[PDB]
Structure formats: C-alpha cells, structure tokens
From Swiss-Prot, chain B:
GO cellular component: cytoplasm
Native species: Staphylococcus aureus (strain N315)
Oligomer and partners: Homodimer.
InterPro entries found in the cross-reference section: Fosfomycin_Res_Enzymes, Glyas_Bleomycin-R_OHBP_Dase, Glyas_Fos-R_dOase_dom, Metallothiol_Trafse_FosB, VOC
Record flagged with keyword Ubl conjugation: no
Cellular location(s): Cytoplasm
Record's protein name: Metallothiol transferase FosB
Gene3D superfamilies in UniProt: 2,3-Dihydroxybiphenyl 1,2-Dioxygenase, domain 1
Family annotation (PANTHER family): FOSFOMYCIN RESISTANCE PROTEIN FOSX, LYASE, PUTATIVE-RELATED-RELATED
Pfam families listed in its UniProt record: Glyoxalase
Keywords: Antibiotic resistance, Cytoplasm, Magnesium, Metal-binding, Transferase
Family designation: Belongs to the fosfomycin resistance protein family. FosB subfamily.
Cofactor: Mg(2+)
Gene name of the encoded protein: fosB
Binding of Mg(2+), residues: 9, 58, 107
C-alpha cells in the first residue's frame, strides 16, 4: 500500500499558445498532444497537462546540472521570463511559481540549522 | 544536455502543520524526513514535498488497479474531502479526486501517459 510515483501535474492557463512557447521552447519540454483547450508535455520526466481558461501558495522546483546554471539563467533572462530576486526563482506566463536548483533537496537538507529535527 | 533533469520538489502552503503531517504521512503514507520552525519535508511516491506554514491546478499520483478500492475506502474512512470525476471513474477504477486539509487538489490514477494517448479530432505530435 503505497502511492507508486507522481502521475502528472495540471496547470490552468489563460493562453495556450503563450504557454506552449514557454514549456516547449523556453524550458525545452516535448509537446505530445493538443485539443482546443488542452496541451500535454513531457518535461523533466514529468507529464504536464495544460488546460486553457493566488499563485503564492505553491511552487514546483526542478533539478539542473550545476555546470548548466549560467546556461539556464541566461536562457530565462534572454527570453524575458519573470525572474524573482545555486538557485533560480521565476514564474510561467500565468504566474505559476517555478524554481531551478543545482542540488537535490535531500543533499541540501543534510548540509548548519542546528535546531531543526531530523527523522532517520 | 540542456534539459531540466527531474523534479526537485513541490512546496505547499498550509494553515496547520500538524493537520498536514497527519494527511501526508498517516493517510497518504508518506515519510516525514525533517521539521523546522514552520516547515516540514516528506518523501511521498518518490517525490519530495515541502510544507510551509502560513496562517487551477492539481497533482496526480499513480496507484495500481489492484489498490484502487483500498485507496478509495482509506480516503472515505478518514473523512477526506472527495471530489467527483468522470462518469465511470470509480466503477472502472480509473481515478479518485480529493483535497488536502487546505484545499489543494490531488488525484490518484491507475493509468499512464501512454495509456491516455492511446485512449485518445485531437492533434497528436
């Protein structure tokens, strides 16, 4: 009895064509299917569904090779992505909050806040 | 190279850390890894989830067909808010929809991406 794996994430978007250009061209995901109001991608090994139709309360973070940090920082800047201010914090065209990090959450957690409580 | 590699984690804001620890760890059977002041981290279904306490989207997890009735009853037995899916989603053991204590929408699904593509006037790439 265990949930086995993430299956997909679903985001609502105002303009499917803007969002296809962001996820397929800027983030280099693969476009799989479209309907009039739907698009499916594979990005970072994840199925993402977009449905065409307040953003402070969640974010989705992705992992990149540390040697590629400048590559990604510059790609987002040169494509006029909204960047907040090795980690990069940004939003998609609708303001869904996203992050890139060069270390896993696990690595980082081990690696100075003495008064946190660890389990195993 | 030049690809995002994998999901690093997801973060949810929550009103009450203890209520959310019960949901993610006791009901969904995730593992609690760390807590800090106003924060808790879990591994669930191979995904790291961060909760931050603060006082249009869903995330779906895969389960086996053979575990569908188990999950459906576990959710009802724990008084989780269950939302309606498509016609036959319950009877054909396809999907369960529900929310966490804060209203974030979640889904359990027995199918894959390929399964859906195969199942599907739409434009295929």
């Amino acid at each position: 009895h265990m949930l086995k794996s993430i299956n997909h994430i679903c985001f609502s978007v105002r303009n499917l064509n803007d969002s296809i250009h962001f996820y397929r061209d800027i983030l280099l995901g693969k476009l799989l299917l479209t309907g009039k109001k739907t698009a499916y991608f594979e990005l970072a090994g994840l199925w993402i569904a977009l449905n065409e139709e307040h953003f402070s309360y969640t974010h989705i973070a992705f992992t990149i090779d540390d040697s590629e940090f400048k590559y990604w920082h510059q790609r987002l800047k040169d494509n006029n992505v909204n960047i907040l201010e090795q980690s990069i914090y940004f939003t998609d065209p609708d303001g869904h909050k996203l992050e890139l990090h060069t270390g896993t959450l696990e690595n980082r957690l081990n690696y100075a806040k003495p008064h946190m409580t660890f389990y195993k």
